[PDB]
Each structure stands twice: as structure tokens, then as C-alpha cells.
Design a protein around this nucleic acid. Structure first.
Ligand SMILES: [Mg+2]
Ligand SMILES: [Mg+2]
Lengths: 74, 166, 78, 113
RNA sequence: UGGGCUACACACGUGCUACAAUGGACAAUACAAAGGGCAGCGAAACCGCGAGGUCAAGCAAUCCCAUAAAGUUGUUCUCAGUUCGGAUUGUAGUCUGCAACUCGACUACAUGAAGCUGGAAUCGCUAGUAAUCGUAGAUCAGCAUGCUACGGUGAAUACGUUC
């Protein structure tokens, strides 16, 4: 972190629909809508992700389509 | 910062009583995270691919050179990449960027890591690193991150990536 | 392709529905390339062409809903 | 621009801006445009920063997945390379469906002429 | 009985539908001719996303198929491999049939390729005429961009016989 040549980055709050569990850093900047104090009291403008709502593993998706299985009585 | 205290509350009792180490300071720490992004053009396209990685992790990024000036493409001391070390306040943060979920096509990354006890990955395009925008980038900025630990067992690398989807 | 009974030819049904008793394998001798696959089909071949072929085709658990014994082609290309 | 990967176009009508996503276009895009405060009025990249949340929560409820089921067409198709017909020897030898394989300008599956 | 006449790297005739803004989508919205229909044409109101399903009175200027369509007034996309075009390709149906795999047709669900008015050359037409969208018929259970018939909109041009 030598001076001068780097772009600046600092923390945010990523307003996810599930608990907003991201107070980490990044180069994005916009208007601080909803600040907090339990997380980084900074530019709150990190909007939304799809982090912890449906993983391909740690969740449940919809069912599979169709086998042979003539369950329609032809 | 909360990722570090989970490395200092959660994995402490686990990895010392599942792998059954003796002392307390024996768990696999996470060392450097190198990020190398080659370019297929030995002419001019790397002039526009400098800024892409700097939006994901603001370290300036070295332009490397070749060693040998090999057969049918390039002469000596061109640029074909951009390595960036990420060590402490970034390695607890870029690995904390668990938003490869934007890629979404079976985010399960790999099964076989490598024979020595490191763990290399792959990406494809503007998916990960959710700070960047999908407007000013009409080129596949695809990267190759890595993750090396002080452990000397690939079984230990299987446990240590408990919180990144495989 | 409609409702109402996917149109197995009935003499083929006459052969299979009592052919499935023992552990013997004498398959078809049909050359009727019309019928679909009833789901109660045992391991046996068929003979489904009549110009010159008895191609023994597998009854293996494919997509059985096809209204055809069309696993046996008719001609070549090259 | 959030629906599947990105929904690239701005400032169009949304009823055809939801055609650039896979699996939905121009006639079920009228149907899946089913939400209050959701109407095409030349506000594609406007008029919604929370109203967009309902019209992809329902798309996640819309059981046919859009892009997540790109494996099922090759499940069905590759299942039909068990050598029956209708995909079997239009791919294992590669002619084209269309019932006339060399009399007309069949070039939609042919490489060139 | 069951295959074939449809097969295939290819060569050429005829035909159609298109490359867009005097264009496309969208609801509303007027004016024909010539034809067929006694187990055939089928209304009205009915159940379907439509392809249609049931029943069902009227019947040869009168009854049925049978709303002609282009255009007018008006909303909208605003010059893009594009809200241009449907070529291709899986699922899920309808109908005719003893049955639609080889080998029909139609519907809505996504898929959406080639293509920017086309080299050398080459045709068709002189007023209801070429072009434009349509209407009916025989053949026929079912399946035509062909086919012979019918109306609607309707221009430009011909001084000249030299090749
Ligand atoms: Mg012939
Ligand atoms: Mg009427």
C-alpha cells in the first residue's frame, strides 16, 4: 500500500434480501442510502446479490422434468 | 474482519480435533492469492486489459515479461499478463468475496485440486467480482486465481475450503 | 398421436402377454414395423423389417414412449 | 439487467426487453408481465428498483427455468442418440430433418454449397 | 405383407417468402365476383392458448361454408443482424385413418440461422394491361407455394425502323 498510484476502496453494506451479510470492501461508489453501525458505517450503496438464497448445493431447487413413465394412461 | 474471527473460533477446534494435531498453532493458514491473467495479443489489447483487474483488487498489477522469446509469436520482454499478490487484508477479503454466484452455472468449482498442496481455480469473464459493471467491457476478461496454504496435504486443502462451495 | 390406446398391433400383444412366462428367449418373427412399446416388455429381440432383414433389436429400457419399432433403418447413404 | 446473467438492453419496452433472456419471448413475455406497477411504457432501465424484485421472484417461481435447464435439451436430444430416428441419423451421420435431404437448397444444416 | 418411387458431397430449371420506417405490432373499423353443398355444407348459442370437441335448426338466388383481403381513422416501435424474417430444433396436442417410424397437415412454447435490393448474363409485359394482397374450384377420408378459373386496387412509356 505504497502511496499515490492506487484507486481507493473501502467497505460497504450489500443490502441482500437475506440478512445482508457483506460488509467487505470494493471499488464501487454511489449514494449511501441506508447506513448501519453493526457493519461498516460507510458508503452503503452496495445494492443486492444472490448470495445465500439458492446455492446449487446448499439449498433446494425445483424438481426434474420427466422420465419415460406414462402416468397419463397414454 | 468477521471472516478472520471465524478462522479464529470455528476452524480452531475443528481442524485440531478432526486431523488431530498436537499443538494449537498448527492449522493450515492461508498464504498469498496470486491472480494471473494472460492476453492472447502480443500487440495492443493488453493496453485495455490493465484497468479490468484493478477494479477487482486495486493493487496496480505488474506487467510481466517472457523468459525465452519462444517460437512463432513474440520476441523478448513483451507483456502477457498481470500478476497481483493479495496477502492479508485482501486475502481475508477477496476470498471473502464468495460471489462467484453471479456465474451461476454450477458454481461447484473443482474436485481434483493439484498434487502438491495448493489449490488453483478458474473463471470465465465478467461474472465474479461484483464491483465491476457489464457495460464498458466488450471482451472476455477471464482470470485465473489461486489459493496456497501452509498445509502439506491435499486432504487438508479439502477441509480448509469448507466455505467456498466445494 | 392422439389419446385412446397407442395402437400396439394385437397379435404382437398375443405373442408377448403369454410369452413372458419362463426364462426362454425366442423373440418375435414379426416384420410389423407399426406398434409402440407396451411397458410390460421382457428381454427379447425382434425382426422388424420385411424386404430382406431380420435385425435383432434390443428391447432395452430406452424412451419406451415412441410409437414406432423404428430402431431398424431401411437404406444406406454412403 | 438482473434477470438471467444480465438483461442487456436499456430504454426499450420491457415486453420485448424480456425476450433477450432465454426461454421467454414475445408471447409468454406478455404473460409473465403479470404484476401490479409493471407495465411497458418505454421505461426499461427506469421506474423500478424494487418493483423488479417481484418480476423475477415469480420467474424463479416460474418453474421452467430459463437458463438453468440448458442441460435438458441435450438430455432429451442426447437420449435420442440411442439410434431410433429423428435426431438419431440426422446427427450420427448428420443429414437434416425436413424430409428432402438433397433436392433443394438445404443449407440451414449444411456447411456451404 | 413389408420396403421403394422422397434416398445424397453435388449441377440446372421453374415457383414462393423475405432483407424493412410510402415498414412491423396492436386493438377497433367498410366495399366483391365466381363457385360448391340431400349423410354432404353447416349456422346460432356453447367447452378450448388455437389447431378444434360435442350436440344442433335450417337446405338449393332464398339456407350453409362465408369475416374477403389490400385501404381508410387512430395508438405504438424511431432506422437496429434489430419488436426485420421463421430457416432450423425438442417437448405437449388436434384431425383424417385399421394405422402418421420410413412418409402427411395444422396449432401455441421457447429456440430464432441465411440475408443490406444481389458478377458475367438473362426474361415477362402496350390500359383494366404488368405488378400487390386476396376469393373459389377440381383432384380428394386426410394432406398443394402447382393448376385452371374470379373480383379489388392500378400507373410510367411507344418520335421512330438504323441495327
Ligand atoms: Mg417422382
Ligand atoms: Mg359468419
Amino acid at each position: 500500500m505504497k502511496q499515490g498510484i492506487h484507486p481507493e476502496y473501502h467497505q460497504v453494506i450489500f443490502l441482500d434480501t437475506t440478512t445482508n451479510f457483506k460488509f467487505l470492501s470494493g471499488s464501487t461508489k454511489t449514494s449511501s442510502e441506508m447506513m448501519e453501525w453493526e457493519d461498516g458505517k460507510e458508503y452503503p450503496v452496495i445494492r443486492l446479490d444472490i448470495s445465500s438464497d439458492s446455492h446449487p448445493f446448499y439449498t433446494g431447487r425445483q424438481k426434474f422434468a420427466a422420465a419415460d413413465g406414462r402416468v397419463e394412461r397414454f | 474482519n468477521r471472516l478472520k474471527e471465524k478462522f479464529n473460533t470455528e476452524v480452531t477446534e475443528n481442524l485440531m480435533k478432526k486431523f488431530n494435531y498436537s499443538s494449537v498453532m498448527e492449522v493450515p493458514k492461508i498464504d498469498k492469492i496470486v491472480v494471473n491473467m494472460g492476453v492472447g495479443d502480443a500487440v495492443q489489447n493488453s493496453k485495455v486489459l490493465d484497468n479490468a483487474v484493478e477494479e477487482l483488487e486495486l493493487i496496480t498489477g505488474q506487467k510481466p515479461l517472457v523468459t525465452k522469446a519462444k517460437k512463432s509469436i513474440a520476441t523478448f520482454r513483451l507483456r502477457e499478463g498481470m500478476p497481483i499478490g493479495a496477502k492479508v487484508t485482501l486475502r481475508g477479503e477477496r476470498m471473502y468475496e464468495f460471489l462467484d454466484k453471479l456465474i451461476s452455472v454450477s458454481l461447484p468449482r473443482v474436485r481434483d485440486f493439484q498434487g502438491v498442496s495448493k489449490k488453483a481455480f478458474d473463471g470465465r469473464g465478467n461474472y465474479t467480482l461484483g464491483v465491476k459493471e457489464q457495460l464498458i467491457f466488450p471482451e472476455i476478461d477471464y482470470d485465473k486465481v489461486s489459493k496456497v496454504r501452509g498445509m502439506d496435504i491435499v486432504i487438508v486443502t479439502t477441509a480448509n475450503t469448507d466455505e467456498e462451495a466445494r | 398421436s392422439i389419446k385412446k390406446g397407442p395402437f400396439v398391433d394385437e397379435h404382437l400383444m398375443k405373442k408377448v402377454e403369454a410369452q413372458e412366462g419362463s426364462e426362454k428367449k425366442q423373440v418375435i418373427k414379426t416384420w410389423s414395423r407399426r406398434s409402440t412399446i407396451f411397458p410390460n416388455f421382457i428381454g427379447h429381440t425382434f425382426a422388424v423389417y420385411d424386404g430382406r432383414k431380420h435385425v435383432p433389436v434390443y428391447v432395452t429400457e430406452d424412451m419406451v414412449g415412441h410409437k414406432l419399432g423404428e430402431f431398424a433403418p431401411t437404406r444406406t447413404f454412403k | 439487467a438482473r434477470i438471467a446473467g444480465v438483461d442487456i438492453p436499456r430504454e426499450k419496452r420491457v415486453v420485448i426487453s424480456l425476450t433477450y433472456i432465454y426461454g421467454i419471448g414475445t408471447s409468454t413475455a406478455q404473460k409473465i408481465l403479470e404484476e401490479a406497477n409493471v407495465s411497458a411504457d418505454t421505461r426499461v432501465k427506469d421506474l423500478t428498483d424494487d418493483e423488479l424484485g417481484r418480476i423475477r421472484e415469480v420467474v424463479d417461481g416460474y418453474k421452467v427455468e430459463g437458463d438453468l435447464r440448458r442441460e435438458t435439451n441435450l438430455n432429451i436430444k442426447r437420449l435420442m442418440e440411442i439410434s431410433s430416428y429423428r435426431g438419431i441419423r440426422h446427427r450420427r451421420g448428420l443429414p437434416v430433418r425436413g424430409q428432402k435431404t438433397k433436392n433443394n437448397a438445404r443449407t440451414r444444416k449444411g456447411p456451404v454449397k
